[PDB]
Amino acid sequence: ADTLLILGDSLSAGYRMSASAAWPALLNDKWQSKTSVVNASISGDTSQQGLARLPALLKQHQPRWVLVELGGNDGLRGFQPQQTEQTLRQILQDVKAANAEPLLMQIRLPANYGRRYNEAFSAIYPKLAKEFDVPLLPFFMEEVYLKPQWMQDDGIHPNRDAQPFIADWMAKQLQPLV
């Protein structure tokens, strides 16, 4: 029984819903008796808070793959993309050293954050992915934005109704990678 560890934030932990309602739990359901999905995501977690938890998780879960979904809160709070990039790099190193396969998810900020900043934030992902030669999954939120009925009031977080769809899309994206 191989393990996929998910190191992410509210987008993966679920926002204003229980963990059982978030897509990782639904993905774990359809990957029943196949692959184990461990959702180690916490709402509001910056890339540093995530990195802070990683060591213990690798040690305890001995995952074959780690899906990294972090940075969104940093950019959202105007952090220094140079810093975020540095944190994500350590995360990838930790994963590799743990003899696990890192899977990086691309993150993008709202258009109302300025072109300058958004481009610098976004570029981090392709850059690290090239640097470590790891898969760079597209940003699943891009498809969700196209369906207002799948978005919560804040225009940021996907709602309960969106979870099964995100689970299916994620299963599709992760398939070749597992």
Ligand SMILES: CCCCCCCC(=O)O
């Ligand atoms: C629009 C960028 C996506 C960032 C969402 C951060 C998720 C959280 O609330 O932990």
